[model samples]
Target: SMYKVILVNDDYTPMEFVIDVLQKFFSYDVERATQLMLAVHYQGKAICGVFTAEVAETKVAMVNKYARENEHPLLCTLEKAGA
Candidate 1:
């Protein structure tokens, strides 16, 4: 099975940070990142990418670490996906 890295929306996190994370971690372009960021804004969460378990988990940690370092509360998590 693969894993999905999901971004959870937060009131304290800036929209630009969300876009940056999507671009940096998931390799999303500006247009795509903006769309997903808006989904997190309005939908409360969005899937950033699908990967192996280790990669998905590590990405979640990295995202949290970066956000925490910048004093944002942006959260990321992992979920199982189709094989």
Candidate 2:
């Protein structure tokens, strides 16, 4: 199964950092990454990408860990694609 990963916006997380995540985790270009970053800012959250369920779970935890380590409140979560 595959899943979609989402990035939740928080008061404290820097927008540039969110874009950084899009680039670092999803290998997204800055153009699209910046666009998605704005969506995350305007909305509660936005999907970063879709991938294998296993990888999605991994991406969720890993990015959360990075954000936490970097002292950001950014949250990354995964949802099943077909659910």
Writing each residue's lDDT as its tens digit, candidate 2 over 1-83 gives 98989988788899889988999989999999988999999987899899998889889998998999999989898778785
How well is each residue in 1-83 modelled by candidate 1, as lDDT tens digits? Answer: 69988899889898989988988888899999999999999999998888998888889999989989988888899879774
| Per-candidate total of colliding backbone pairs | 0, 0
TM-score of model number 2: 0.93
Per the 3 Å backbone cut-off, how many clashing residue pairs does candidate 1 have? 0
**lDDT of all predictions:** 0.89, 0.89
Candidate 1's C-alpha runs over 4 A off are none
At residue 83, give the lDDT of candidate 2: 51
- The local lDDT score (0 to 100) that residue 73 gets in candidate 1 is 82
